[PDB]
Design a protein around this ligand. Sequence first.
Ligand SMILES: [Cl-]
Ligand SMILES: [Zn+2]
Ligand SMILES: [Zn+2]
Length: 358
Amino acid sequence: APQQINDIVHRTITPLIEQQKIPGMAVAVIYQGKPYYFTWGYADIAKKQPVTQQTLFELGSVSKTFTGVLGGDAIARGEIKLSDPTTKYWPELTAKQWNGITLLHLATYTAGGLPLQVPDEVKSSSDLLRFYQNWQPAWAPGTQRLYANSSIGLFGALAVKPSGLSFEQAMQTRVFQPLKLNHTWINVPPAEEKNYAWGYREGKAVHVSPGALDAEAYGVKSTIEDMARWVQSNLKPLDINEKTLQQGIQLAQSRYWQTGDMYQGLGWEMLDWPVNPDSIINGSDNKIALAARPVKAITPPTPAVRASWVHKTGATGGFGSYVAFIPEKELGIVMLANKNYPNPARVDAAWQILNALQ
Ligand SMILES: [Cl-]
Ligand SMILES: [Zn+2]
Ligand SMILES: [Zn+2]
């Protein structure tokens, strides 16, 4: 890698690892469209297995960017419209509170207060229907944003129904395979478990537990190389030869709602570039990121703005991830760690690196 990249990465990430006690970490810096890879530490502490460029990490909520793009691909196929009522795809959702709640609302967390998590007691299709049937909104749809797995998770599950494919099959055939993300998985096959890092929470090795709508909201595992290719694909959608996927990537970076200086895409979140670093750092703290905030609609949605900071944080019990990129600058970063450490530390480090290389 260019000396300037090696230098800023050492000076930023090695102290981050020291400060946060991260057992293993992989970073990709995309500079002038090309990825440069860095690894530290161990995927499995007890077995002394180092992190490599083939190590699989849990992406947590970065998975939502895949869901958003898969939804965009379905829009480009004409299979769904974001204005469609939720009940068009789940007619059994007869409760009156669902009148007026569209796929747009589900995808952008604006349905009216769907909860952060699907309750852990939901373990069957009947349980899932009862959960959504009995949920009572706190606000009218399209007025407040409340980040929620139960919202975009349902969007993903319904967006694939016209295709007749399961969510996993749709994701594999329509996103992973065309982009050659051949070491990206919703379910890690046995032959690949040898590459699956352990997450660490309070010193204990852990993997994410199964849960309702997990694939849609937080269940993807990937390598640093596949995640760099994911960033490249979102940086340069015109390089994607499948037209519906090219357009789906673009639609996930459209701006559908605004709150403060932040814009909501499909999975992705965006700010205008140049960005105020304190806003993205402070706004990444879960005290803000998970709070209800009023939103203003953007009608029609702003087509993807190249001068944007596009990003997403993600976590599981044992992992912490961050992706950010700037299309106009062909510049991005992926940070994958097997400890869930605070979001503002992730965003600060990412800013320091990309700011140094702009
Ligand atoms: Cl140093
Ligand atoms: Zn040093
Ligand atoms: Zn392989």
